From a paper:
In this work, we first report the crystal structure of wild-type SVA 3Cpro, which indicates that SVA 3Cpro adopts a chymotrypsin-like fold and possesses the Cys-His-Asp catalytic triad conserved in most serine proteases. During the refinement of the SVA 3Cpro structure, we observed a portion of extra electron density located in the cleft mainly composed of E1’-F1 loop and α3. The region is composed of dominantly positive residues, including His75, His78, His79, Arg147, Lys198 and His202, which neighbor the proteolytic site. Based on the lipid-binding assay and lipidomics data, the CL 74:6 molecule (with a molecular composition of C83H150O17P2) was assigned to the identified electron density in SVA 3Cpro. The CL molecule, especially its two phosphate groups, was well defined in the electron density map after refinement. Interestingly, the C-terminus containing the natural autocatalytic processing site (GEPLATMQG) from Molecule II, inserts into the proteolytic active site of Molecule I. Therefore, despite a crystallography artefact formed by the two contacting molecules, the SVA 3Cpro-substrate complex likely captures the physiological peptide cleavage process of SVA 3Cpro. In our SVA 3Cpro–substrate complex structure, the main chain carbonyl carbon of the substrate Gln211 was 3.1 and 3.7 Å from each γ-sulfur atom (Sγ) in two alternative sulfhydryl groups of the Cys160 nucleophile. These distances imply that it would be difficult for Cys160 to covalently bind to Gln211 through a thioester linkage.
Seneca virus A (SVA) is an emerging novel picornavirus that has recently been identified as the causative agent of many cases of porcine vesicular diseases in multiple countries. The full-length SVA genome is approximately 7.3 kb in length and contains a single open reading frame (ORF) encoding a single polyprotein that undergoes proteolytic processing and cleavage by the viral 3C protease (3Cpro) into four structural proteins (VP4-VP2-VP3-VP1) and eight non-structural proteins (L-2A-2B-2C-3A-3B-3C-3D). SVA 3Cpro is composed of two topologically equivalent antiparallel six-stranded β-barrel domains (A1-F1 and A2-F2). Three closely positioned residues (His48, Asp84 and Cys160) within the proteolytic active site of SVA 3Cpro comprise the canonical catalytic triad.
Residue numbers in the entry: 4 to 211
The structure:
Amino acid sequence: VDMGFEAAVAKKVVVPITFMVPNRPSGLTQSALLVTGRTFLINEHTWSNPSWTSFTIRGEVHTRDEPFQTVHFTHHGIPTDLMMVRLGPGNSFPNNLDKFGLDQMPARNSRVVGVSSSYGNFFFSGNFLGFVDSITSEQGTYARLFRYRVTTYKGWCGSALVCEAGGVRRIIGLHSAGAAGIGAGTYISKLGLIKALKHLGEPLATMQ
Ligand SMILES: CCCCC/C=C\C/C=C/CCCCCCCC(=O)O[C@@H](COC(=O)CCC/C=C/C/C=C/C/C=C\C/C=C/CCCCC)COP(=O)(O)OC[C@H](O)COP(=O)(O)OC[C@H](COC(=O)CCCCCCCCCCCCCCCCCCC)OC(=O)CCCCCCCCCCCCCCC
């Protein structure tokens, strides 16, 4: 059970983010995934909730009326729970692109490892149950997910999902939902990330 990769994910990728609201005594804390430069990945249902007035990430406070550049991923016309957010100028994130994406799909009942900063830092684990085209949720249908056998809790959203295929372990999801001891995470592809970063203007050298 080598977790050198997952520890690297915990060290460089997963961070706490807290949404501050004028509706409730405390901020809603979850996880975010630093991608590169000034962009990170976040759950759509958290980002789009109209209540928050600021959020904190990597020691910075950002208000809602700031001009974020964002990409909301869809699949065959159905929304996914995945959002990409680029902040204004500031201290750069690590370049974590090498940690995302698998070219082969994980073998059924291989091990999924979640990497979370939602309650302090922790890992969770469960076996891969396969991809699903959609889930039916309390906030509607969401597209392009995969499921894993493990009981998950409110706040674990945004945790990185590390799967294995072809001898390699990579992040291919972030946690979205739970239902009766089975969690669901929204799928992340390297090609989607690359094209979203280009749309957002996140400067990257292209390997020729
Ligand atoms: C074993 C054999 C394998 C099997 C084969 C598999 C399949 C075979 C074929 C099958 C049938 C064919 C069918 C196709 C399947 C193919 C396989 C496949 O999967 O292909 C997929 C293609 O995607 C991929 O490439 C993945 C990648 C996967 C594969 C792709 C194919 C390959 C392609 C290329 C191949 C190789 C190339 C390799 C390259 C190497 C790398 C490249 C290096 C270079 C198909 O998926 P689809 O086409 O369906 O979607 C496209 C994309 O995924 C998402 O779209 P996106 O652009 O990113 O979204 C646009 C927009 C962004 O948001 C905003 O910007 C507005 C927000 C704007 C606000 C902010 C922006 C403005 C800024 C403000 C201020 C900014 C300040 C500065 C500004 C300056 C500039 C500003 C910006 C420019 O989002 C919205 O929509 C609005 C969002 C709303 C839509 C949602 C609806 C409801 C929303 C809410 C949730 C629910 C709540 C309900 C309330 C309503």
